[PDB]
Amino acid sequence: FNSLIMLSEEQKVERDIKLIELYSKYNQLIQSSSFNNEELAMLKEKLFSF
Amino acid sequence: ISSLELYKYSIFFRNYIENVAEDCLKNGLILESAAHNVSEVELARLKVQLKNALLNCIISYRFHGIGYVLVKTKDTLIDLEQPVNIELPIGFEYLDYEYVRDLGVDFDHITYKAVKIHKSRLIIYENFDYILKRYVPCYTESFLLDIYLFEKIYVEIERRIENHNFLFYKDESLVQLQDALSSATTSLNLRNLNDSLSQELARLKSNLNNEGMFYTATPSASLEVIKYDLSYLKEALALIKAKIGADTKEPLTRSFNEQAKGLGNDGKGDRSNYYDFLKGVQEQVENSCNLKLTKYFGLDMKFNSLIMLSEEQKVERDIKLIELYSKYNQLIQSSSFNNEELAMLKEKLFSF
Amino acid sequence: ISSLELYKYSIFFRNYIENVAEDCLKNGLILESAAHNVSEVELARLKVQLKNALLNCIISYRFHGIGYVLVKTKDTLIDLEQPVNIELPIGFEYLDYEYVRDLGVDFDHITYKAVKIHKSRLIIYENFDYILKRYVPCYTESFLLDIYLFEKIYVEIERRIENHNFLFYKDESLVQLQDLSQELARLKSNLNNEGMFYTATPSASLEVIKYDLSYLKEALALIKAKIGADTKEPLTRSFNEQAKGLGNDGKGDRSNYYDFLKGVQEQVENSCNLKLTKYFGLDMKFNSLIMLSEEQKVERDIKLIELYSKYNQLIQSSSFNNEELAMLKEKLFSF
Amino acid sequence: ILKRYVPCYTESFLLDIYLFEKIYVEIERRIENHNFLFYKDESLVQLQDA
Amino acid sequence: ISSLELYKYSIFFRNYIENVAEDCLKNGLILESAAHNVSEVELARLKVQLKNALLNCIISYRFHGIGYVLVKTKDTLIDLEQPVNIELPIGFEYLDYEYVRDLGVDFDHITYKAVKIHKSRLIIYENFDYILKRYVPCYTESFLLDIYLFEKIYVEIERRIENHNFLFYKDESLVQLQDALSSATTSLSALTQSNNNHSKDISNLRNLNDSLSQELARLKSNLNNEGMFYTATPSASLEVIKYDLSYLKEALALIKAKIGADTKEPLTRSFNEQAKGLGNDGKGDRSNYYDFLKGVQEQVENSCNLKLTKYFGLDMKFNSLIMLSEEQKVERDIKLIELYSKYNQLIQSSSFNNEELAMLKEKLFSF
Amino acid sequence: SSATTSLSNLRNLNDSLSQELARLKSNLNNEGMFYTATPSASLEVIKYDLSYLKEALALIKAKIGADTKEP
């Protein structure tokens, strides 16, 4: 069955914008952080998107 | 209660029947040819005639339960019986329900007035109820009763408008002498008594008009104002409006032309009940048309979008999309993500 | 209830009939020639006469169910029977319904008063109901009854306005005088003088008799509700209290009156262009129902210029592939 | 619990719908004579009974 | 008041019974194998059958006080009596309460219809009340009375809907002349019965009521024609008799209050007007329905895992009652990334001692 | 009532009586008009009330709220 909730075009654009902002923030943190590999990995699982 | 009589008498029933068809064909159709050989002008004329036929088709579907559109080709009146393999239609003509005889789905022909027409040349839009095992209209006996009561309220209002207030006069005067003698002897001169009674009544009326004072002689004479009431009809109107709103989904019919159709753009996926109903009707009409337009005539029909965007809305959407593209380009240029991660982002993005 | 009598007596019915036509021809028409040979001044005069004819055509369509406009060319009165192949009309003249005899669609001529006119020279705007299999007006018996009651309320108000309050007086010696009467009327005048009504009889009685209007008030409320339910014209529904709702709100959610006017305009355009283009080489169009103000035009231009600037900036400062840019082009409305 | 196939409605729901219709049934029954006149007179029956 | 009869007649009772089970199994289950050898497809099919069994198990738990789910393995019908040490179940089947005979916890077997089944193959969900020392359902006599009154209100409404308004007509006309002759004849015939022209009395009565029907038809005809009801008798009377509904309205208000006090299910309390209240508000102040559902889920999990892990090597879990939306997930990720960035900035641009940084680490929730 | 007392010729008597009573009652109930011939006959609607119970419910809720701390 198709999804009961159907997103509008504007809602899709807004969600895409928010996701792109989230990815940009993640990239900035990774580039400008000096965290350990274990800590970064542990952050990865606790993050929903990553 | 007769549906035809109610349709003739009441404009409300007519509007309720026709509003759905008018809304369905408000935004128009799109006509295309599979062969891509028909010129656009001829196809546009065909689309105009198709819209004209479809309006009456939907009206007949709602009123009777079935609607017939004949696809007229370059053939003689006797050739309508013969089936059609591949042809380009000349036009579309709505067929009156009362002049069409159909014996059921097991038969592949109908009789029109007695011309025999094969079903391959006919667009049929039917409302078959499997529980009732018969074709039924869009209205029921309760709905007919509601409309009848809605009219009967004002029928009664007209019946009692003239004498809503009147005078009740009791007088044991010479006038009662006159009317008592008349009563007794008619149960058994008298016309002179008639004349005198009318003369005295007119005299008292003249006195009332002249000096604003009604005078009488009898100590037991009485004068009382008799008045009617309308609370029953007001409450009945409220209940009938509630019942109509419960019994139909057409916003104009429910709200007595006070609410909008609710077919605008709100930027959200939460569409209206009328929008859903119109979408379902449009899908059924599209299926009915394309079941035979594509197979026998090589033509495809589509309905225009129910929601029509304004110029300002289009500009705003374009601006937002351009902003999204700019943000994506900036992220791609100023990120060091892996190829697999970028690809995975691509699928999870709606626009990309 | 007679529609003609109601039209004669009530201005409300007249306004209800004429408002739709006035609104349809409020914004005007556009007239064009396929051959592109007619001068614009003559075409504008033709458009003026066409508008004048179309007003009465729509009025007759609403009142009777059919409307006739004769396309007058450079021909004699006997030449009207002959068909027309290609010609440039001299003008347009509305034909009265009562003087037109039409036997149906199966015939190609009408009789006007007894001049025989071919149907190729006539613009016909008809409202045919397939359920009833006849031409019908825009009103029904219930609507006529509603209008009649609306008038009858004030008819009754006039009937009982003068004697809404009066005096009922009972006295025996006074009728000993009456049966002198004018002298007791003079004694009532003495009441008016001294502010005190005096009487002799211990059983004499004086009571104020009063009328009431709640019935008529409630009936007016119900009749207004019925009229609002029975028509879509905003002025008729709201008793000239609401606007036509034909403005620009920046949204696609148009009004019911706008939809009705658009449908009427489409029908009129079809009826005119069925024979103007085929027999006369002329095309007619209706002006847009929504008219933008100067400030709205400036705002729209500003927004469009901003959109173009953003597109140019993105194109200049992006490194997208050609296929991706093209795909963006189709999905963009403006580009 | 019932060990049988049952529809989505019950007797109470059917009763509710039936009452919903019966209200307007009664409205139609008593719409015409909601207001009327009761008149008492002896001479007029001296006329009518004859 | 019979619970079965109320269930048959009223859909409200059925919805009240089934809503809790539907909400508990709305979000689904998670099935795992301790041995980590079963494929995911077979385990998913097992989970589907487990959900199907658990719905009826919870329904029976609420209606009767106990619910039985048989864990079907690759064995014969006679092998059900024998205990199970370690096996992989083939499926789950809910067992009807009426066909199950259990003698108590002191016994390790039940009889099903007469197949003897060991209790090690059965998932039992029971509501034992220690004060009453017996298994009890989720409803009581007062709740049953409330539902019965809720239905009886509309029963009475149907009883008095047709004749809510009628006419009482008293007339001493020719009709009463006939009627009074009839009444005297009937009284004298009653005296004779207590003890002969009674047949004449009968023929009277018959013709008299015939004329009565004719006259009533004529009166109604006049009323319909000229809208005026006329009568001859100076003592004639006509009065409208009307019924009232304030009692039933007030009773409905009180019954709604009692139902809301007597149950915690939001739909039942609000008459399907309120939401379930199982959303995410960003706060730890959860709803009463959420707490009730969590307790029910914990009890069901305990009942299942008491024997799934020990005898079958399987573990079951319930999905989270609160389901986050995509936007909420993105917002939470953004906030967490901001927190990590702030922590990194503080660490890089601080000169705190190692002990102080460590002490900050424990007192921080995320780190 | 005397008939029922004797039960706790007569067959025909009771049949005729029952027929007449049933027809009279049926006519009066069906015509939506209750007719009687006695000038002193009376018909009144007797109704109950619930304000006492409503007020008692309010007071009891107040007392329970005062007597316990469980929200």
mmCIF file of C-alpha atoms in Angstrom, chain B residues 98-348:
data_model
loop_
_atom_site.group_PDB
_atom_site.id
_atom_site.type_symbol
_atom_site.label_atom_id
_atom_site.label_comp_id
_atom_site.label_asym_id
_atom_site.label_seq_id
_atom_site.Cartn_x
_atom_site.Cartn_y
_atom_site.Cartn_z
ATOM 1 C CA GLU B 98 -34.663 7.643 -21.555
ATOM 2 C CA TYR B 99 -33.939 6.709 -25.195
ATOM 3 C CA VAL B 100 -31.327 4.019 -24.400
ATOM 4 C CA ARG B 101 -32.262 0.374 -23.797
ATOM 5 C CA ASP B 102 -29.518 -1.793 -22.283
ATOM 6 C CA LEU B 103 -30.066 -5.405 -21.223
ATOM 7 C CA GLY B 104 -26.931 -5.637 -19.056
ATOM 8 C CA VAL B 105 -23.212 -6.279 -19.229
ATOM 9 C CA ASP B 106 -23.743 -9.713 -20.809
ATOM 10 C CA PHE B 107 -24.840 -7.946 -24.017
ATOM 11 C CA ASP B 108 -22.568 -5.981 -26.352
ATOM 12 C CA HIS B 109 -25.171 -3.704 -27.961
ATOM 13 C CA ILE B 110 -27.852 -1.149 -27.104
ATOM 14 C CA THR B 111 -30.943 0.234 -28.827
ATOM 15 C CA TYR B 112 -31.310 3.998 -29.282
ATOM 16 C CA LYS B 113 -34.285 6.024 -30.497
ATOM 17 C CA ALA B 114 -34.523 1.644 -33.079
ATOM 18 C CA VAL B 115 -30.859 1.950 -34.070
ATOM 19 C CA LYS B 116 -28.603 -0.853 -32.830
ATOM 20 C CA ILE B 117 -25.280 0.493 -31.529
ATOM 21 C CA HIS B 118 -22.335 -1.695 -30.565
ATOM 22 C CA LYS B 119 -20.917 -1.093 -27.095
ATOM 23 C CA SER B 120 -17.394 -0.576 -28.482
ATOM 24 C CA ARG B 121 -18.480 2.878 -29.725
ATOM 25 C CA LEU B 122 -19.985 3.928 -26.373
ATOM 26 C CA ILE B 123 -18.416 5.404 -23.244
ATOM 27 C CA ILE B 124 -20.397 4.069 -20.276
ATOM 28 C CA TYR B 125 -20.171 5.635 -16.806
ATOM 29 C CA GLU B 126 -22.189 3.511 -14.371
ATOM 30 C CA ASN B 127 -22.658 3.355 -10.592
ATOM 31 C CA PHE B 128 -23.258 -0.311 -9.752
ATOM 32 C CA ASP B 129 -23.908 -1.180 -6.101
ATOM 33 C CA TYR B 130 -22.922 -4.779 -5.390
ATOM 34 C CA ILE B 131 -24.928 -4.924 -2.153
ATOM 35 C CA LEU B 132 -28.075 -3.857 -4.026
ATOM 36 C CA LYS B 133 -27.020 -5.613 -7.274
ATOM 37 C CA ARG B 134 -28.396 -2.705 -9.310
ATOM 38 C CA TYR B 135 -27.496 0.725 -10.644
ATOM 39 C CA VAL B 136 -28.435 3.476 -8.188
ATOM 40 C CA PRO B 137 -28.331 7.303 -8.294
ATOM 41 C CA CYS B 138 -26.362 9.537 -5.919
ATOM 42 C CA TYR B 139 -29.425 10.274 -3.740
ATOM 43 C CA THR B 140 -31.703 8.232 -1.485
ATOM 44 C CA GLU B 141 -35.216 8.411 -0.061
ATOM 45 C CA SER B 142 -34.039 10.163 3.110
ATOM 46 C CA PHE B 143 -32.261 12.846 1.064
ATOM 47 C CA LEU B 144 -35.397 13.331 -1.040
ATOM 48 C CA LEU B 145 -37.423 13.666 2.173
ATOM 49 C CA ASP B 146 -34.980 16.280 3.488
ATOM 50 C CA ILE B 147 -35.310 18.361 0.316
ATOM 51 C CA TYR B 148 -39.102 17.994 0.388
ATOM 52 C CA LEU B 149 -39.245 19.235 3.990
ATOM 53 C CA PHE B 150 -36.911 22.116 3.114
ATOM 54 C CA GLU B 151 -39.434 23.252 0.505
ATOM 55 C CA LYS B 152 -42.507 22.453 2.622
ATOM 56 C CA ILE B 153 -41.342 24.853 5.345
ATOM 57 C CA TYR B 154 -41.744 27.826 3.010
ATOM 58 C CA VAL B 155 -44.886 26.259 1.544
ATOM 59 C CA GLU B 156 -46.402 26.477 5.039
ATOM 60 C CA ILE B 157 -44.974 29.983 5.491
ATOM 61 C CA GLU B 158 -46.839 31.064 2.359
ATOM 62 C CA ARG B 159 -49.966 29.271 3.582
ATOM 63 C CA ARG B 160 -50.083 31.215 6.863
ATOM 64 C CA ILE B 161 -48.377 34.511 5.945
ATOM 65 C CA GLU B 162 -51.528 36.510 5.155
ATOM 66 C CA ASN B 163 -53.494 35.830 8.358
ATOM 67 C CA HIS B 164 -50.665 35.522 10.878
ATOM 68 C CA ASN B 165 -52.438 38.161 13.006
ATOM 69 C CA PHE B 166 -56.181 38.786 13.046
ATOM 70 C CA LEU B 167 -59.027 39.953 15.274
ATOM 71 C CA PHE B 168 -61.515 37.718 17.110
ATOM 72 C CA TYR B 169 -64.645 39.721 17.948
ATOM 73 C CA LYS B 170 -67.552 38.499 20.094
ATOM 74 C CA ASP B 171 -70.601 40.750 20.409
ATOM 75 C CA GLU B 172 -74.180 40.051 21.526
ATOM 76 C CA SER B 173 -75.347 43.179 19.701
ATOM 77 C CA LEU B 174 -77.819 43.816 16.876
ATOM 78 C CA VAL B 175 -75.249 42.059 14.679
ATOM 79 C CA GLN B 176 -75.657 38.891 16.748
ATOM 80 C CA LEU B 177 -79.425 39.344 16.499
ATOM 81 C CA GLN B 178 -79.021 39.445 12.711
ATOM 82 C CA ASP B 179 -76.714 36.435 12.490
ATOM 83 C CA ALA B 180 -78.790 34.365 14.937
ATOM 84 C CA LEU B 181 -81.953 34.986 12.915
ATOM 85 C CA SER B 182 -80.002 34.094 9.771
ATOM 86 C CA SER B 183 -78.687 30.893 11.371
ATOM 87 C CA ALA B 184 -82.101 29.775 12.621
ATOM 88 C CA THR B 185 -84.100 30.551 9.486
ATOM 89 C CA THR B 186 -81.471 29.199 7.069
ATOM 90 C CA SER B 187 -81.482 26.012 9.143
ATOM 91 C CA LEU B 188 -85.269 26.115 8.691
ATOM 92 C CA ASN B 189 -86.056 39.590 4.714
ATOM 93 C CA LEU B 190 -83.113 37.369 5.618
ATOM 94 C CA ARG B 191 -81.189 39.024 2.789
ATOM 95 C CA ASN B 192 -82.104 42.399 4.297
ATOM 96 C CA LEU B 193 -80.664 41.127 7.585
ATOM 97 C CA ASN B 194 -77.543 40.165 5.608
ATOM 98 C CA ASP B 195 -77.319 43.696 4.221
ATOM 99 C CA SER B 196 -77.803 45.359 7.615
ATOM 100 C CA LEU B 197 -75.150 43.150 9.230
ATOM 101 C CA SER B 198 -72.619 43.963 6.506
ATOM 102 C CA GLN B 199 -73.496 47.667 6.750
ATOM 103 C CA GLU B 200 -72.916 47.754 10.511
ATOM 104 C CA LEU B 201 -69.646 45.816 10.212
ATOM 105 C CA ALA B 202 -68.381 48.280 7.599
ATOM 106 C CA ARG B 203 -69.521 51.169 9.810
ATOM 107 C CA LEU B 204 -67.517 49.838 12.759
ATOM 108 C CA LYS B 205 -64.504 49.310 10.481
ATOM 109 C CA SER B 206 -64.816 52.920 9.311
ATOM 110 C CA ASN B 207 -65.014 54.123 12.921
ATOM 111 C CA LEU B 208 -61.868 52.138 13.746
ATOM 112 C CA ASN B 209 -59.993 53.689 10.823
ATOM 113 C CA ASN B 210 -61.291 57.202 11.554
ATOM 114 C CA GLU B 211 -60.851 57.727 15.293
ATOM 115 C CA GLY B 212 -58.564 54.835 16.261
ATOM 116 C CA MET B 213 -61.121 53.714 18.842
ATOM 117 C CA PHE B 214 -63.266 50.587 18.600
ATOM 118 C CA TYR B 215 -66.435 50.984 20.652
ATOM 119 C CA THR B 216 -69.055 48.357 21.463
ATOM 120 C CA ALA B 217 -72.326 48.248 23.386
ATOM 121 C CA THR B 218 -72.491 44.764 24.898
ATOM 122 C CA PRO B 219 -71.014 44.397 28.416
ATOM 123 C CA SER B 220 -69.955 40.846 27.458
ATOM 124 C CA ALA B 221 -68.331 41.915 24.178
ATOM 125 C CA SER B 222 -64.769 40.716 23.625
ATOM 126 C CA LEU B 223 -61.924 41.527 21.231
ATOM 127 C CA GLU B 224 -58.747 39.438 21.110
ATOM 128 C CA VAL B 225 -55.750 39.314 18.770
ATOM 129 C CA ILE B 226 -55.075 35.822 17.398
ATOM 130 C CA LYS B 227 -51.431 35.265 16.417
ATOM 131 C CA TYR B 228 -49.429 32.483 14.764
ATOM 132 C CA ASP B 229 -45.908 31.256 15.540
ATOM 133 C CA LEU B 230 -42.807 30.130 13.630
ATOM 134 C CA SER B 231 -40.528 28.466 16.218
ATOM 135 C CA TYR B 232 -41.479 25.012 14.919
ATOM 136 C CA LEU B 233 -40.399 25.940 11.392
ATOM 137 C CA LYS B 234 -37.181 27.576 12.625
ATOM 138 C CA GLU B 235 -36.186 24.472 14.598
ATOM 139 C CA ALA B 236 -37.157 22.261 11.654
ATOM 140 C CA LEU B 237 -34.944 24.349 9.362
ATOM 141 C CA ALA B 238 -32.024 23.926 11.766
ATOM 142 C CA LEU B 239 -32.524 20.152 11.919
ATOM 143 C CA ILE B 240 -32.951 19.890 8.132
ATOM 144 C CA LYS B 241 -29.740 21.843 7.535
ATOM 145 C CA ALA B 242 -27.931 19.498 9.922
ATOM 146 C CA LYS B 243 -29.346 16.456 8.111
ATOM 147 C CA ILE B 244 -28.386 17.794 4.671
ATOM 148 C CA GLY B 245 -24.862 18.544 5.867
ATOM 149 C CA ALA B 246 -24.626 15.012 7.235
ATOM 150 C CA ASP B 247 -26.115 13.457 4.081
ATOM 151 C CA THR B 248 -23.955 15.143 1.423
ATOM 152 C CA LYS B 249 -20.286 16.037 0.971
ATOM 153 C CA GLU B 250 -20.714 18.915 -1.492
ATOM 154 C CA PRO B 251 -19.618 22.033 0.445
ATOM 155 C CA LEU B 252 -22.027 24.421 -1.289
ATOM 156 C CA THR B 253 -24.980 22.101 -0.664
ATOM 157 C CA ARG B 254 -23.987 21.548 2.974
ATOM 158 C CA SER B 255 -23.355 25.222 3.766
ATOM 159 C CA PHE B 256 -26.183 26.672 1.614
ATOM 160 C CA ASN B 257 -23.655 28.379 -0.691
ATOM 161 C CA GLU B 258 -21.871 29.933 2.306
ATOM 162 C CA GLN B 259 -18.582 27.985 2.170
ATOM 163 C CA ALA B 260 -15.947 27.752 -0.538
ATOM 164 C CA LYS B 261 -15.178 24.623 -2.546
ATOM 165 C CA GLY B 262 -11.881 24.200 -0.679
ATOM 166 C CA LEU B 263 -9.837 23.420 -3.802
ATOM 167 C CA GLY B 264 -7.017 25.899 -3.171
ATOM 168 C CA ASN B 265 -3.333 25.426 -2.407
ATOM 169 C CA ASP B 266 -2.383 25.569 1.281
ATOM 170 C CA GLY B 267 1.146 24.183 0.947
ATOM 171 C CA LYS B 268 0.186 21.012 2.828
ATOM 172 C CA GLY B 269 -0.839 17.486 1.911
ATOM 173 C CA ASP B 270 -3.980 17.616 4.075
ATOM 174 C CA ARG B 271 -6.506 17.838 1.249
ATOM 175 C CA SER B 272 -10.257 18.297 1.616
ATOM 176 C CA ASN B 273 -13.045 15.726 1.501
ATOM 177 C CA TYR B 274 -14.481 17.441 -1.576
ATOM 178 C CA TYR B 275 -11.049 17.232 -3.209
ATOM 179 C CA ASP B 276 -10.869 13.496 -2.480
ATOM 180 C CA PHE B 277 -14.396 12.953 -3.825
ATOM 181 C CA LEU B 278 -13.639 14.909 -7.004
ATOM 182 C CA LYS B 279 -10.379 12.996 -7.477
ATOM 183 C CA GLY B 280 -12.219 9.682 -7.193
ATOM 184 C CA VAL B 281 -14.896 10.794 -9.655
ATOM 185 C CA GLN B 282 -12.211 11.998 -12.075
ATOM 186 C CA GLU B 283 -10.353 8.683 -11.802
ATOM 187 C CA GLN B 284 -13.546 6.745 -12.540
ATOM 188 C CA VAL B 285 -14.330 8.963 -15.545
ATOM 189 C CA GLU B 286 -10.764 8.599 -16.840
ATOM 190 C CA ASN B 287 -10.948 4.811 -16.542
ATOM 191 C CA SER B 288 -14.318 4.713 -18.308
ATOM 192 C CA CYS B 289 -13.096 6.873 -21.197
ATOM 193 C CA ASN B 290 -9.662 5.278 -21.644
ATOM 194 C CA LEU B 291 -11.068 1.736 -21.551
ATOM 195 C CA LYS B 292 -12.191 2.292 -25.157
ATOM 196 C CA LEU B 293 -10.524 5.493 -26.409
ATOM 197 C CA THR B 294 -7.062 3.900 -26.374
ATOM 198 C CA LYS B 295 -8.074 0.399 -27.484
ATOM 199 C CA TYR B 296 -10.434 1.284 -30.344
ATOM 200 C CA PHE B 297 -9.563 4.891 -31.253
ATOM 201 C CA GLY B 298 -5.912 5.436 -30.314
ATOM 202 C CA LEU B 299 -6.756 8.431 -28.117
ATOM 203 C CA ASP B 300 -5.846 9.176 -24.503
ATOM 204 C CA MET B 301 -7.614 11.591 -22.166
ATOM 205 C CA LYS B 302 -6.479 13.128 -18.884
ATOM 206 C CA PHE B 303 -7.968 15.575 -16.391
ATOM 207 C CA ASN B 304 -6.216 18.801 -15.461
ATOM 208 C CA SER B 305 -4.943 19.194 -11.915
ATOM 209 C CA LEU B 306 -7.667 20.166 -9.457
ATOM 210 C CA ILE B 307 -5.293 22.538 -7.642
ATOM 211 C CA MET B 308 -4.155 25.439 -9.840
ATOM 212 C CA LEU B 309 -1.159 27.449 -8.646
ATOM 213 C CA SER B 310 -1.111 31.228 -8.932
ATOM 214 C CA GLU B 311 1.729 33.167 -10.546
ATOM 215 C CA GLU B 312 3.024 34.384 -7.176
ATOM 216 C CA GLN B 313 2.966 30.830 -5.809
ATOM 217 C CA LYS B 314 4.906 29.625 -8.860
ATOM 218 C CA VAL B 315 7.519 32.357 -8.362
ATOM 219 C CA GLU B 316 7.846 31.501 -4.663
ATOM 220 C CA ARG B 317 8.262 27.792 -5.432
ATOM 221 C CA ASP B 318 10.903 28.576 -8.063
ATOM 222 C CA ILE B 319 12.777 30.767 -5.568
ATOM 223 C CA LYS B 320 12.727 28.022 -2.932
ATOM 224 C CA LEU B 321 13.905 25.391 -5.428
ATOM 225 C CA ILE B 322 16.759 27.637 -6.584
ATOM 226 C CA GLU B 323 17.781 28.183 -2.956
ATOM 227 C CA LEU B 324 17.779 24.411 -2.403
ATOM 228 C CA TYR B 325 19.963 23.874 -5.478
ATOM 229 C CA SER B 326 22.380 26.582 -4.319
ATOM 230 C CA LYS B 327 22.660 24.963 -0.882
ATOM 231 C CA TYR B 328 23.285 21.553 -2.465
ATOM 232 C CA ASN B 329 26.001 22.989 -4.718
ATOM 233 C CA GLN B 330 27.660 24.733 -1.768
ATOM 234 C CA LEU B 331 27.640 21.522 0.283
ATOM 235 C CA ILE B 332 29.088 19.492 -2.597
ATOM 236 C CA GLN B 333 31.829 22.051 -3.261
ATOM 237 C CA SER B 334 32.760 22.568 0.409
ATOM 238 C CA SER B 335 32.435 18.977 1.643
ATOM 239 C CA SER B 336 34.899 16.079 1.651
ATOM 240 C CA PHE B 337 32.370 13.262 1.957
ATOM 241 C CA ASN B 338 32.973 9.837 0.462
ATOM 242 C CA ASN B 339 31.404 8.879 -2.860
ATOM 243 C CA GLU B 340 29.208 6.234 -1.221
ATOM 244 C CA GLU B 341 27.980 8.743 1.368
ATOM 245 C CA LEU B 342 27.163 11.338 -1.305
ATOM 246 C CA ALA B 343 25.306 8.735 -3.365
ATOM 247 C CA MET B 344 23.364 7.589 -0.292
ATOM 248 C CA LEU B 345 22.424 11.215 0.371
ATOM 249 C CA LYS B 346 21.217 11.444 -3.235
ATOM 250 C CA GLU B 347 18.553 8.743 -2.864
ATOM 251 C CA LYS B 348 17.357 10.014 0.517
#
